Amino acid sequence: MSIQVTGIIEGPLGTPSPGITIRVVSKISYRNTYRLSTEDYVTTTGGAYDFQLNEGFHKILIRYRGASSFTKLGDVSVSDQTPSPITLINLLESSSPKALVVKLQELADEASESAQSASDDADQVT
Amino acid sequence: MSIQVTGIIEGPLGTPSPGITIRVVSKISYRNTYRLSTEDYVTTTGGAYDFQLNEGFHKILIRYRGASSFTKLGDVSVSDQTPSPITLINLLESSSPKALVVKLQELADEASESAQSASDDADQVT
Amino acid sequence: MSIQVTGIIEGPLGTPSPGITIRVVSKISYRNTYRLSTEDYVTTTGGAYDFQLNEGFHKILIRYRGASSFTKLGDVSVSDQTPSPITLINLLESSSPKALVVKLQELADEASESAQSASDDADQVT
Amino acid sequence: MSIQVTGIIEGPLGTPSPGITIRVVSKISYRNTYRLSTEDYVTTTGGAYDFQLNEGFHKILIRYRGASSFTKLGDVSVSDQTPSPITLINLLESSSPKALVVKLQELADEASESAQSASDDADQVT
Amino acid sequence: MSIQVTGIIEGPLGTPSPGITIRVVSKISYRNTYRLSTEDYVTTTGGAYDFQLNEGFHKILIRYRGASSFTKLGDVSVSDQTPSPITLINLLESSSPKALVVKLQELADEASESAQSASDDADQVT
Amino acid sequence: MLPNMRSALKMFEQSVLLKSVETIRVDFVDDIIITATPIRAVVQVADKKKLNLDSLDWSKQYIWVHSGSKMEIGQFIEWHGKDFKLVAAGDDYSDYGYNAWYGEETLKPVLVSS
Amino acid sequence: MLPNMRSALKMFEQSVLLKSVETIRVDFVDDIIITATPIRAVVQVADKKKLNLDSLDWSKQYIWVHSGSKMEIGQFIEWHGKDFKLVAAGDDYSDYGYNAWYGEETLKPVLVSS
Amino acid sequence: MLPNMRSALKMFEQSVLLKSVETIRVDFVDDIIITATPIRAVVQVADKKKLNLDSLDWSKQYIWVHSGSKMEIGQFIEWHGKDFKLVAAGDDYSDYGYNAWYGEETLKPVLVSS
């Protein structure tokens, strides 16, 4: 399902920030979402961001209290199964092309090692 | 014989938007239609669209209510023997290169399922 | 399963000549680099093509009988996820990217099925 | 004879367009027609174009409802015998230098194969 | 049939000198590339020329008797469609284009007659 | 509102033919159909036409046209007696309503129809 | 107070797409994700687009954009039908409120998403 | 209405002879008839006439004439004592009512009739 992200944006000094303007824009023609489709969200009091993010490939931009340009934090990619209750940081670290590929490599090596261990154990029992 | 498209244009945050206009311009002249034969269709309430499209080849562009220009949504090569009750997303995707990253995510997904199968099998044998 | 691409030669492919011929050269990585295997297909009346296709890297060429040379329709990578009843003009749009190396990591599924085979071979001894 | 063309101009959305200004201009000194000889035709209601065009070598331009420049569809060539009741699309696809030459090549190969088959059958009967 | 070009040497060809001489070199594609065959013709009084001409590629040169060299009148490709009673200045205007290869494809007619010759040869046996 | 030099181009106009070549080839034999249109323009000299030195001296007149109609490189422009290839120092203020190009007289005779 | 040409840039604006490439590689195989944004700008021609000579003639249109948004070199700008690499003669009056760049049409087709 | 600098050329006029050569040859032996006409013009210096260095120093005066009459390259112009070959930096505002050329003094004596 379309996952929901929820966290509390915190400045480096333990003070939340209420007036954050987050922009999510997709850039893949994906089910029920279009290329270069933009959308905004403003965090409520306490500096807490919560929204259901439709899935696909979405780059995320920050604007703090007052900012000329928009800071680019990264580009998440959300699929059908992906942890529902998640902060945005663990979304971006765990979903980005470099991180996605490197996670895939990690997983493939893990699976290969598991397979070899299982095969060796089967040989030992046989 | 002509194909029809019905769907809902969900915003990237799972929020619909009743202001987008979708334009298609003929790629190359084909029966009953000519090169550069533009046409635009406004979206309806609830972010839904339901419109008839002729067979042929067409650049498809869209523009959002707050947008200024059109965004290059893609190009589609529609003909007969394509399903008539088809949404716009699936038509684009069926007649466009699959996005790199969605393929990468699907790969990571099947990889994760395989790895979990291997690990649980190792647990079971042990 | 192996795919079956069919349709009516239209649009940029040319007029529906009742004698048009196509040619697919498949790059099957045989031992060291690969082997190229050619196959020429012809068309029935009305410019109709209908032919099955194996999976892998295929380069499609088009030309008319009695013409002077081919025309580069282009490359394509038929994978285990492309639609079966598809037209040729549509498939030409899904050209081969360089995701093949990420695709190689689909061996995780093979590793898992090998692990499960080892498990369900080992266990029966009791 | 001087052939006549009937068709219904259709925008990609099933909505005909009445106010199309089609510009046919000739660039060959051909019987009863001169080089660079221009003329216009405006489509009637229902988006249906019909006109008798004198034969020769005529390039055709379109202007939609409002357009700065003229869009070039191509250049038909009509001879003494050429199908009388024809749409303009099948006129341009079947009559243009590239298409004309390639049709000639197609025809030459067809006739050559027919001749070879006839000769071989005559040999078989003799 | 073979043509007969005649007229009065005049205009850019020069004054009607009653000794003027012309020279045609024919490029008859003999075995590997071709053979050039020369022939020099002179003129009666008043600068009058009158001479038959075979078909094919002919390069025409002009000069006066006792002059120092020729003058390049130019090439020409006399085909089975050029008018018979024509002047030389007029024919020089119908120079050889590179349509010759397309003219090769006239062999289809030959093909057909061969086919017919086969047909009306086979049937008599009864 | 993008400025539009178009109205500032009409006074200086001149009739001129704009052609383009769409080469056709079979078995690698060159034929060239032509596309000619009567287009508006304005002409000034572009590089003061000099006499270069070689085995034989040669000279090609330079003109640089403006027009409200788009002009691709692979097109010729005939205004008096010899077409000019639209080769150099061209610039497209298409969004500003016109475009310009230098021109090279193709010493070949003018492409009427071929 | 630093002068700010920004307000003197709005009138001449035009919509345009600004993309950047962040190449990704594994085992030395090239893939390229894209980042595209709709940005404000203004376009003029930069070097009057000529026809160079080589084994085959080639030509790349030059545009030189201004915008209030920052534009790094390794970025492309598409305005009509072909993106331009932001390569040359660029200058950043960022503290003065805008920046400019020349542009090189990458004769490759436009990077939609890859 | 094309602007016409013609009236802006009369005041500065000067009498001058405009000749052209139409070479004639038999058995590859050079003879040259001449065609000379008294034409209107105006003369300024074109390249400040310097002294080049070689085995022997040489110098050719440069003049650049305007006239309402057409002036092809292969023509000479004599104004004082030595004809000038109309070689360089010439430009034809013929549609604007005049044309101009640089000039090269042919250190040969002036072609009277040959």
Q: Do D28 and F113 touch (CB under 8 A)?
A: yes
Of C104, C102, C82, C101, nearest to C93 by C-alpha is C82
CA distance C19 to C11: 16
- Residue C90 gets which letter from DSSP? H
CA distance H114 to G21: 73
Token pair 């492919």 in the structure block, residue:
C13
Let me know the angle formed at the C-alpha of A71 by A65 and A75, rounded to the nearest 5 degrees: 130
Residues in chain E after which the backbone breaks (C–N beyond 2.5 Å):
none
Helix (H, G, I), strand (E, B) or coil at B6: strand
Residues of C in contact with D106 (CB under 8 A): 17, 19, 64-67
Torsions phi, psi for E44 (to 5 deg): -80, -175
**What distance lies between CA G76 and its chain's CA centroid?**
4
Residues of A in contact with C111 (CB under 8 A): 111-112, 114-115
Task: Assess contact for F19 and F35: CB atoms under 8 A.
Answer: yes
Helix (H, G, I), strand (E, B) or coil at G8: helix
CA distance A23 to B66: 14
* Chains contacting A (3 or more CB pairs within 8 Å): B, C, G
CA distance D121 to D123: 5
CA distance H46 to H88: 10
Both tokens of G72, joined, read 């790094």
Token pair 């509390």 in the structure block, residue:
A8
Q: Are strands H29-45 and H14-26 parallel, antiparallel or unpaired?
A: antiparallel
Cβ neighbours of H31 (radius 10 Å): 9
CA distance F16 to F82: 11
G94 touches chain A (CB under 8 A): no
Token pair 């680019």 in the structure block, residue:
A72
Q: Do H92 and F49 touch (CB under 8 A)?
A: yes
Do you know the residue count of chain A? 126
CA distance H65 to H15: 11
Q: Which residues of H69-98 are buried (b: 16+ CB within 10 A; e: fewer)?
A: eebebebbbbbeebbbbbbbbbbbbebbeb
Residues of C in contact with A106 (CB under 8 A): none
CA distance F27 to E99: 12
Residues in chain C after which the backbone breaks (C–N beyond 2.5 Å):
none
Determine the residue of chain A that is closest to C113 in CA distance: A115
The residues, ordered by sequence, that sit 6+ positions from A51 with a Cβ below 8 Å of its Cβ are A4, A5, A41, B13
Q: Which residues of B75-92 are buried (b: 16+ CB within 10 A; e: fewer)?
A: bbbbbeebeeebbbbebb
**What distance lies between CA C101 and its chain's CA centroid?**
18
CA distance F47 to C50: 59
Both tokens of H40, joined, read 């209107």
Torsions phi, psi for A65 (to 5 deg): -45, -60
Helices (H), chain F: 7-10
Amino acid making up residue G53: L
Determine the residue of chain E that is closest to D101 in CA distance: E102
How close does chain F come to E112, measured CA to CA in Å?
A: 23
Both tokens of E73, joined, read 């009148």
DSSP string, H51-103: -B-SSS-B---EEEEEESS---SSEEEESSSS-EE--SSBEEETTTTEEEEEE
Residues pairing with A31 in the sheet: none
Rg for chain D, CA atoms, rounded? 19
- For residue F82, with 0-12 CB atoms within 10 Å meaning exposed, 13-18 middle and 19 or more buried, which class applies? middle
**What distance lies between CA G80 and its chain's CA centroid?**
12
CA distance E58 to E28: 9
State the structure-solving technique: cryo-EM
Task: Assess contact for E5 and E92: CB atoms under 8 A.
Answer: no
CA distance H63 to G1: 55
A35 touches chain G (CB under 8 A): yes
Let me know the angle formed at the C-alpha of C47 by C45 and C53, rounded to the nearest 5 degrees: 105
Q: Do A122 and C125 touch (CB under 8 A)?
A: no
Both tokens of H15, joined, read 């009498």
Both tokens of H78, joined, read 């004599």
Q: Are strands E3-8 and E85-86 parallel, antiparallel or unpaired?
A: parallel
Token pair 């012309």 in the structure block, residue:
E22
- For residue E64, with 0-12 CB atoms within 10 Å meaning exposed, 13-18 middle and 19 or more buried, which class applies? middle
Task: Assess contact for D36 and D26: CB atoms under 8 A.
Answer: yes
CA distance B25 to B5: 16
Task: Assess contact for D56 and D26: CB atoms under 8 A.
Answer: yes
Task: Assess contact for H18 and H36: CB atoms under 8 A.
Answer: yes
Do you know the residue count of chain E? 126
Cβ neighbours of E103 (radius 10 Å): 12
Both tokens of E58, joined, read 């002919």
Residues of B engaging C, defined by a Cβ cutoff of 8 Å: 27-28, 30, 56-57, 77, 79-81, 94-98, 100, 103-104, 107, 110-111, 114-115, 117-118, 121-122, 124-125
Which phi-psi region, left, alpha or beta, contains residue G25 (left: φ > 0; alpha: ψ -120 to 50)? beta
Determine the residue of chain H that is closest to F53 in CA distance: H87
CA distance B117 to H82: 101
Task: Assess contact for A75 and A97: CB atoms under 8 A.
Answer: yes
How close does chain F come to G3, measured CA to CA in Å?
A: 24
- Residue F46 gets which letter from DSSP? S
The residues, ordered by sequence, that sit 6+ positions from A5 with a Cβ below 8 Å of its Cβ are A49, A50, A51, A53, A86, A87, A88, A91
CA distance D26 to D35: 6
Of D84, D78, D88, D81, nearest to D47 by C-alpha is D88
DSSP string, E1-39: --EEEEEE--GGG-S--TT-EEEEEEEE--SSS-EEEEE
